[PDB]
Amino acid sequence: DIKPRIIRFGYGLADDSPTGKASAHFAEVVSKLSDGKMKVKTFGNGALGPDEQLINSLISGSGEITFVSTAPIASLIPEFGVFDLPFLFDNEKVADTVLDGPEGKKLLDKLPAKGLIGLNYWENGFRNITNSRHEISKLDDIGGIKLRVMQNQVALSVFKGLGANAIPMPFTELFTALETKTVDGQENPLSTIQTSKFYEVQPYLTLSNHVYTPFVFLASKKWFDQLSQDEKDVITQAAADSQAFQRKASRQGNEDALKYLKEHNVKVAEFSTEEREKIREKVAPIVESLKAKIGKETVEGVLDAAKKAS
């Protein structure tokens, strides 16, 4: 029971990012599983707007499928802010274990009430600080930096406690903000730094890996519910395959990104063994202050899951 169907899949990253390629993989998988009846049209690079507009398009039904960072989802479901706390996941395997396990499910289960289906989690990744003002090799270097952040109370409060002037901004507006110095810096994974070409206008990169951002692979509930069971299985089986392809392409992509930015002679700094610890004491209090705004059971469950996984 599968009827011809055209399915729109907008997103914010460049088409040749690892996640942009995974979207094409998902379109390919949906077509094979549907005998080419279900055709997914991708609109990369912010064509259908930023994460916030993509969320609302799925809510209203003008859009069918997307992937977005968790941070904008906090504007609907505050618990999703948990992922903007620095240093929750030691590595990608902890991240996979937790997001794919009970605590990640609890959060995805909160989506249908707001009109969304959380198909599964994809990888955005560990985020790194880029700027055009001066090298950032110490916590004190953040002081007063004009840093764009994702549009969330958690993100804003984290970086302001680290001493930056935190400017919430949609991703789709970032490249211009960087090039014109309306903001000094930004924070994203290396493969995004590369494929959005932020390095072109950010002479300084700091390998800080301070926050891990999951993507949520989203479907419009309104649209998904009108599908056949056969049509739903196409989406959910495609989602499962593309997740594995996704995570693999993202992590190869972060490796290739590192090679590229280094061989391109970006000025790459790092946080000293200590400066990293200097960072942790600074946040611990505001992290503690932010639990009330995320959900204590969420924060503590995620931290407990993260502790068992490692």
Asked whether residue 48 is marked as a ligand-binding residue, the answer is no
Pick 13 or 99: Cβ nearer ligand TF8: 13
Asked whether residue 115 is marked as a ligand-binding residue, the answer is no
Q: How far is the CB of 17 from ligand TF8 (least distance, A)?
A: 8
Contact indicator for 161, 286 with CB cutoff of 8 Å: yes
CA distance 173 to 252: 27
Number of residues that bind ligand TF8 (CB under 6 A): 13
| Region class of 241: left (phi > 0), else alpha (psi between -120 and 50), else beta | alpha
Contact indicator for 107, 302 with CB cutoff of 8 Å: no
Asked whether residue 247 is marked as a ligand-binding residue, the answer is no
Residue 298 DSSP label: H
- Residue the block writes with tokens 């599968």: 2
- Of residues 6 through 25, those in contact with ligand TF8 by CB under 6 A are 11-13
| Region class of 49: left (phi > 0), else alpha (psi between -120 and 50), else beta | left
CA distance 54 to 115: 13
Contact indicator for 152, 171 with CB cutoff of 8 Å: no
150 is a contact residue toward ligand TF8 (CB under 6 A): yes
Give the DSSP H/E element, type plus range, for residue 10. Answer: strand 5-10
Residue in 23, 34, 69, 130 binding ligand TF8, rule: CB under 6 A: 69
- Of residues 159 through 218, those in contact with ligand TF8 by CB under 6 A are 171, 188, 192, 213
51 is a contact residue toward ligand TF8 (CB under 6 A): yes
- The one segment of 5-13, 74-82, 115-123, 199-207 that binds ligand TF8 by CB under 6 A: 5-13
Do the bridges between strand 38-43 and strand 146-149 make them parallel or antiparallel, or are there none, so unpaired? unpaired
- Here's the x/- map for ligand TF8, 104-143, by CB under 6 A: it reads as --------------------x-------------------
Pick 50 or 301: Cβ nearer ligand TF8: 50
Q: Which residues are annotated as a binding site?
A: 12-13, 51, 69, 124, 127, 148, 188
Name the residues that contact ligand TF8, by CB under 6 A.
11-13, 50-51, 68-69, 124, 150, 171, 188, 192, 213
